[PDB]
Subunit: 293 residues, 4 copies
């Protein structure tokens, strides 16, 4: 079966104000491209082409000016609104229609992943047609996240959203794969105390049925989020140092669509033209004549 993708890019701007008074978080660039390009690329890497972008009323159209219908890139992009930041799990209600009876995946708009064989990392959750899959990453500050505890032999046994007393240092990252059950599970949720329809609650509903797979995203991968002013800067220096060392870009959607045969040489050259004066255009052009392994 076919899997559809959602990017949740909405949310409170009150935190990063006044920095984000003119531009919301996921519309800011990370080094040399819009934040949203990173998670989008994530979904492309997992082989997903039909993607729903959920944002604030005010931001939806911006994302549409930026990305279009996605046909330029071999994608089918649609848009929906989150009237109010009332929980990541609402994504499934906003998207019920878009999901239909298909499998799905959700990624958070400010989640930036980097590393080797992200294809094989995703591939495996991608292929599971029953149940749900999530990824755990070792962090310094687990209490800011959904936290997954494991027993002595490695199996996940508990989940807790932002525990005052975390049971482990493994955070659940902002990338989740679901089967056809997810929308009915979300339907039944009641808001937590902190006023939110919790993605941790969905994931636990699968876990309590023995249907939650928890994969380790190893320390050789970099999972960054653009939470704060200090974190955005580190994410920018991190992308800059890789890009400048390699002369290759991270998370360039045009490149990915081309590597995946979603667009052809000819399509890519058309994308390159209007960018020809700058480095991003120059990059795309180099890609039609260079083999990159």
């Amino acid at each position: 079966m076919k899997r559809k993708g959602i990017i949740l890019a909405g949310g409170s701007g009150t935190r990063l104000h006044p920095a984000t008074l003119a531009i919301s978080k996921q519309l800011l660039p990370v080094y040399d491209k819009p934040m949203i390009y990173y998670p989008l690329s994530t979904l492309m890497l997992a082989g997903i082409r039909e993607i729903l972008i959920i944002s604030t009323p005010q931001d939806t159209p911006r994302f549409q000016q930026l990305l279009g219908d996605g046909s330029n890139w071999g994608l089918d992009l649609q848009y929906a609104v989150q009237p109010s930041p009332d929980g990541l799990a609402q994504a499934f209600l906003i998207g019920e229609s878009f999901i239909g009876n298909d499998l799905s995946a959700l990624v958070l708009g400010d989640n930036l992943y980097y590393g080797h064989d992200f294809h094989e990392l995703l591939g495996s959750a991608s292929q599971r047609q029953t149940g749900a899959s999530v990824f755990a990453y070792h962090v310094l500050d687990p209490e800011r996240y959904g936290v997954v505890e494991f027993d002595q032999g490695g199996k996940a046994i508990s989940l807790e959203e932002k525990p005052l007393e975390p049971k482990s240092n493994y955070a659940v990252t902002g990338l989740y794969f679901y089967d056809q059950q997810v929308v009915d599970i979300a339907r039944d949720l009641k808001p937590s105390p902190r006023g939110e329809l919790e993605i941790t609650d969905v994931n636990r509903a699968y876990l309590e049925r023995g249907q939650l797979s928890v994969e380790i995203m190893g320390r050789g991968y970099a999972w960054l989020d653009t939470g704060t002013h200090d974190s955005l800067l580190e994410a920018g220096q991190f992308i800059a140092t890789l890009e400048n060392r390699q002369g290759l870009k991270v998370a360039c959607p045009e490149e990915i669509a081309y590597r995946q045969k979603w667009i052809d040489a000819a399509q890519l050259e058309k994308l390159a033209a209007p960018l020809a004066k700058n480095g991003y255009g120059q990059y795309l052009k180099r890609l039609l004549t260079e083999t990159v392994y």
Copy 2:
């Protein structure tokens, strides 16, 4: 009375797609909009009435962000530059705003930092005839207007983006003008870059013996935020200073309060909505801490 102009225009293409959603001078430098930095330079210069010139598309955004200025004791006006045909256009678009007064222009992506910037400025601020500009030693003079000095340190020439720069002293993006400026700009023809050049206005004043070129010393940081790499360095530079000091660089509310353009009750009102983050926490602390 010196009136101020901020010019925040500029051809987008370079930085796309990064700035596809948002113009460069709308991006944050660390923890605050880029425009706050040149706005705060004018405020430091004692200028309260300011004109912000942007593109048709970015003008409404600057207004959304900044309003009419009254919250900060300022009088902010807006005008549009339909096409990027040179910085000197600001004086034609700004003719009526300027009227018969002195002026100051600053470029919207110039960030300045250092000690006694308020005295560095007041100096040019207070000469009522002529024009004044600042020269700063850089690695890449060719990217800028360049000022050549004679053996005795007197300015003798200006060239816009010269192939063979005659010195390493770039003219920075901050300019002080007397009443002659609008007419000087009225009589300029485009350059072979196809622009109405600020270097041409400054040279017109030089050719009348009426240009003052002050040295902006190497103890001041003059940063340009308009490449991806340079914006990152600037964000890091501000970050290091703010985290070391627990003070903010170029916080307009703070400067306006320090200048008595707003009172305590007004600042308290500014801090309210931001109370839930670090910036609001900052504004509140300024009501009760003495900072030298």
Copy 3:
């Protein structure tokens, strides 16, 4: 078993006068001495018997810092290189250390990070024939050995610092060799730089169809610290990973404990003298924490 060599020598003139004080490979990269990185690399390759070759002045310092290696379950020995006469000299200097064994040489200023590095290394290490090198996509191939591939992905040429590189794929500072290397290096002659070149050794294997070149993907970071700018960038990179993860990159005590080369007891004892700092604390937490 394969034996390892770290060539940690040279001037580091690009690093004057910072290295006037201390040798580049002794400078830290963020929180640990630079040499820890190439050492950790060897350890991840399964290598425990390692020869550290450095200048006559630094050798005793390396010796002071790392000891005989027993503390970490290793066998560390030391030799001097009298003048920076080429990386291929490691094989003559280290002739007797190698004996009749497989070997590996890593450069002292190269750092590697990435998922499954362990398996990427283990694969080259476990080969019992020919030579293995890794090719990595870079923006400036003119600074390294450059590998060219035919249309089928087969390596067809190698060049040392070509002014016009035939590809963007550089040969990284990590090399694995069978029993053929000492005798190949014995017959090398100096090059123009005036160096016995590792590239010539590697072309000698390529000529016999015995050089395995594996691509090290863009999902890996390969950085080197041989310029002021590059050392800065490398320290930030590490900082950012370790501060996010609450784990360390290239911690030899960790690695040695994970590979079972030392036990809990041995580990707790390494940590104690470092208990007042985060490093010690870090080693201590490893006893009680499971890290996948």
Copy 4:
């Protein structure tokens, strides 16, 4: 004439295991050894006769790096601090060196930067009585000696690392004294902390009304490089400045040359050995360029 002391000692625990190999004041801040920075500060104060105090292991390493100073027109000497028991030991260790002169002390890991620092220093240095220190707004004053002022801006108390700082003004690591210092140091008794405290020397001057506390404004950067994080920040700070400007911060040869302590011929000789790297090219450029 005023005599200068650089206290470059201490363990560097916060910095392990990074500093096992080398002391923290030998580590680079971007492009030159950390010690260059306080050395530069004393030179900018017009001080040419300096005593470098360090641990017994680091003394020889500083001697090998700086020598006797004659190449830079300075007169450098060396002494050892047996154990890190307080900044104020520097005055007992350096008793004979100070003799009957004015003196100054700077910490080896403190870096200063900003416009007219030259003049800010020279004013304290040129004073011929009492004690002078500088106060600087920080985010974490608990780590420093902290100065409390009255409602009129007058320093009234000093506390060493208070849990509840009375203000956010820290005492930076640069101190100027008259001939009273040595006898005052002679009378101190170890603290709680267990050190002979500089803060107690300063309070003794304050009790006699003879401590001048000047504000170092927010327009100056005062950084310390005593942790792995702070060292990274400082190097990035210097890099941004030096890459923007095409000039160097705290280059001793430059400052010596500018002060007329060494001549053109002497300088050209300094550059030669460094000619193949940037630092050398920079000294050479200073022979022909006018820098304001």
